[PDB]
Enzyme design. Structure first.
Site, short mmCIF file in Angstrom:
data_model
loop_
_atom_site.label_atom_id
_atom_site.label_comp_id
_atom_site.label_asym_id
_atom_site.label_seq_id
_atom_site.Cartn_x
_atom_site.Cartn_y
_atom_site.Cartn_z
N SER A 1 1.73 -0.01 -6.61
CA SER A 1 1.66 0.80 -5.39
C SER A 1 2.60 1.99 -5.37
O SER A 1 2.27 3.03 -4.79
CB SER A 1 1.88 -0.06 -4.14
N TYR B 1 1.47 5.51 -6.20
CA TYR B 1 0.72 6.28 -5.20
C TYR B 1 1.61 6.84 -4.11
O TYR B 1 1.13 7.46 -3.16
CB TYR B 1 -0.42 5.43 -4.63
N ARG C 1 -7.83 2.77 6.80
CA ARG C 1 -9.23 3.04 7.07
C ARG C 1 -9.99 3.07 5.77
O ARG C 1 -9.42 3.36 4.72
CB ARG C 1 -9.39 4.39 7.78
N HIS D 1 0.86 -1.17 0.00
CA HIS D 1 0.00 0.00 0.00
C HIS D 1 0.90 1.23 0.00
O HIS D 1 1.55 1.57 1.00
CB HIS D 1 -0.99 -0.01 1.17
N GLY D 2 0.99 1.87 -1.16
CA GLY D 2 1.80 3.06 -1.31
C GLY D 2 0.96 4.22 -0.88
O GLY D 2 -0.27 4.18 -1.02
N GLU E 1 -5.59 -5.08 -8.39
CA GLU E 1 -5.93 -4.31 -7.21
C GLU E 1 -6.69 -5.22 -6.25
O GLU E 1 -7.75 -5.74 -6.60
CB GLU E 1 -6.77 -3.08 -7.57
C1 DRL Z 1 -3.40 4.96 -1.99
C2 DRL Z 1 -3.20 3.68 -2.81
N1 DRL Z 1 -4.09 3.31 -3.74
C3 DRL Z 1 -3.96 2.20 -4.48
C4 DRL Z 1 -2.85 1.36 -4.31
C5 DRL Z 1 -1.92 1.73 -3.33
O1 DRL Z 1 -0.92 1.06 -3.11
N2 DRL Z 1 -2.09 2.89 -2.60
C6 DRL Z 1 -2.64 0.07 -5.12
S1 DRL Z 1 -4.20 -0.53 -5.88
C7 DRL Z 1 -4.75 1.03 -6.62
C8 DRL Z 1 -5.10 2.01 -5.50
#
Ligand code: DRL
Length: 357
Positions: free
Chosen positions: A247, A250, A225, A209-210, A339
């Site tokens: 990721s 983002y 959240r 999760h970036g 995703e």
């Molecule tokens: C903030 C965030 N959004 C997403 C991803 C993420 O890593 N961070 C990967 S799936 C597409 C949406």
């Protein structure tokens, strides 16, 4: 009289992290990058009331967009009120009308970031206990303690280090490869109890999760959240990727000296029975009945035959180790990369935080 400041207990890397994620410059940079007027909306002026009022303006705009022409206020007029509530800066030109679903969600995503900036401000407020005591912690220990989240810096020889390095290197971009600097094990307690609820749920995967730096403190404090007004290609959930490069897009980082610093989480996600899709569905608010997750499947996936496992709190957790390979079954998918979605906060536990350059 003069209160004593106690020496810092934190190692250099953790001190730097703590400095970065509470940095006022960083928070203000983030606002300027989102076109906000930092002069009209100072960091210490940010309030929960203001943010709520902004969301209320966006809700009215949403209703105007979803039709029909019913003789309500115009999109220009309802935009103008939003910009009164949340001051924007466009070189002192008028801001643009919020007249499309794409632009509306962008203003929603912006307010969600601003809500996590406000959270970090509120967190830092000096308590009444802190004003009576005659010795105080080093400011960085103080800020660290405010998170109520245990961070432990990993060294090269930690059991999972190479597994995580391999996950990063094999699934990251082939040219623009993010460089690992540090890994912290994350133990946010108060996540554990709700996470244990899903202990019978198999199919656990460590997923990326970036995030932008501006929301890291909030994530450490609160966990990942599902916020009101949040959304995306797979609906109202928490978004993860098995591909670092997905990721990494983002990761909004910040320039330090001669480098760009950014942060990425690895979360243990209890996926359970997966529902696979191959077309966008922004209206999803849960998996179909009998499913625990929704996976928007990409043209590629890290080579499953290279998957390994880590043992985390007595559970087996799948960690991809392979380079992305084509998945013929999803070659016509609207998603280039997968995703991974869950629709309740308890199905994820933060496990690692990585600093990348
Ligand atoms: C903030 C965030 N959004 C997403 C991803 C993420 O890593 N961070 C990967 S799936 C597409 C949406």
């Amino acid at each position: 009289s003069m209160k004593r400041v106690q020496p810092c207990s934190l190692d250099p890397a953790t001190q730097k992290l703590i400095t970065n994620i509470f940095s006022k410059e960083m928070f203000k940079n983030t606002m300027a990058l989102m076109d906000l007027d930092v002069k009209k909306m100072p960091l210490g002026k940010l309030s929960k009331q203001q943010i709520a009022r902004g969301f209320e303006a966006l809700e009215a705009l949403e209703e105007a967009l979803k039709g029909p022409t019913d003789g309500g206020q115009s999109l220009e007029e309802l935009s103008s009120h939003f910009y009164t509530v949340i001051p924007h800066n466009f070189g002192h030109s008028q801001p643009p009308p919020i007249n499309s679903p794409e632009l509306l969600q962008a203003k929603k995503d912006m307010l969600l970031v601003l809500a996590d900036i406000e959270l970090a401000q509120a967190l830092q407020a000096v308590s009444e206990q802190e004003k009576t005591v005659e010795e105080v912690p080093h400011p960085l220990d103080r800020d660290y303690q405010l998170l109520k989240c245990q961070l432990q810096l990993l060294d090269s020889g930690a059991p999972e280090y190479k597994v995580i390095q391999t996950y990063l290197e094999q699934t990251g971009s082939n040219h623009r490869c993010p460089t690992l600097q540090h890994i912290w094990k994350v133990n946010q307690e108060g996540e554990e109890d709700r996470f244990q609820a899903h202990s019978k749920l198999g199919n656990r995967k460590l997923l990326w999760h970036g995030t932008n730096m501006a929301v890291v403190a909030a994530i450490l404090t609160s966990g990942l959240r599902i916020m009101p007004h949040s959304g995306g290609r797979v609906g109202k959930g928490i978004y993860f990727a098995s591909e670092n490069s997905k990721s990494a897009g983002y990761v909004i980082g910040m320039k330090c000296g001669a480098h760009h610093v950014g942060y990425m989480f690895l979360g243990e996600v209890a996926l359970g029975r997966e529902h696979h899709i191959n077309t966008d569905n922004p209206s999803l608010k849960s998996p179909p009945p009998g499913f625990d997750s929704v996976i928007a499947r990409g043209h590629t996936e890290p080579d499953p035959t290279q998957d390994t496992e880590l043992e985390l709190d007595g559970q087996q957790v799948v960690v991809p180790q392979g380079q992305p390979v084509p998945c013929p079954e999803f070659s016509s998918s609207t998603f280039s990369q997968s995703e991974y979605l869950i629709y309740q906060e308890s199905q994820c536990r933060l496990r690692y935080l990585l600093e990348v350059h």
